[PDB]
């Protein structure tokens, strides 16, 4: 059981409401590899390229623009504000592949949706 699952499911619920506005600012597809034992326990895609966006399990149906790899616990610590994702990147706990420049847009945008 991964705690990250609750977050991804809630994100999916959120996008059915704020999706269209999130997809216009981001315009990208994000893949997530959540580890538990250095072992990938779950893969998630957050597609923000059309409509209201979508969250689904597994690898991206097409190319992912950015892939983020981190532990279940570290993901949760970033979600709860206890671990800065940029510090985690420079420390080696958070890995990012692909277009790392796109990673900025995502946190900032949903956060601003976390204050409404
Ligand atoms: C151009 O960037 C310079 C290098 O900095 C890299 C920073 O990388 C950290 C940002 O990547 C993340 C990591 C996690 C997240 C969260 C977990 C907040 C996204 C979420 C809540 C939608 C899962 C967002 C962006
Ligand atoms: Cu920033």
Author numbering: 5 to 120
The authors write:
The Kamer and Jarvis groups have extensively studied the human steroid carrier protein (SCP-2L),23 a single-domain 13.5 kDa protein containing a hydrophobic tunnel, as a scaffold for ArM design. Crystals of SCP_Q111CBpy and SCP_Q111BpyAla were soaked in solutions of Cu(ii) ions and their structures determined by X-ray crystallography.
The structure of Cu(ii)-bound SCP_Q111CBpy was determined to 1.52 Å resolution, and clearly confirmed the incorporation of 2,2′-bipyridine at C111, which is positioned at the centre of the C-terminal helix, α5. The bipyridine rings are sandwiched in a parallel fashion between the amide side-chain atoms of Q108 (one turn up on α-helix 5) and Q90 on α-helix 4. The B-factor of the Bpy moiety is 92 Å2, suggesting flexibility in its position. Additional electron density was observed in the 2Fo–Fc map around the solvent-exposed face of the Bpy moiety, and a single peak in an anomalous difference map confirmed this is a bound Cu(ii) ion. The Cu(ii) atom lies in the same plane as the two pyridine rings and is 2 Å from the two pyridine ring nitrogens, and thus we assume that the Cu(ii) ion adopts an octahedral coordination geometry. The high B-factor (108 Å) of the Cu(ii) is consistent with its position in the flexible α-helix 5. Only one water molecule could be modelled around the Cu(ii) ion, but the positions of Q108 and Q90 suggest that their amide side-chain atoms may play a role in coordinating the other (unmodelled) waters in the coordination sphere. In addition, the longer linker confers greater flexibility (as reflected in the B-factors), explaining the lower enantiomeric excess. This is consistent with the experimentally observed preference to produce the R enantiomer by SCP_Q111CBpy.
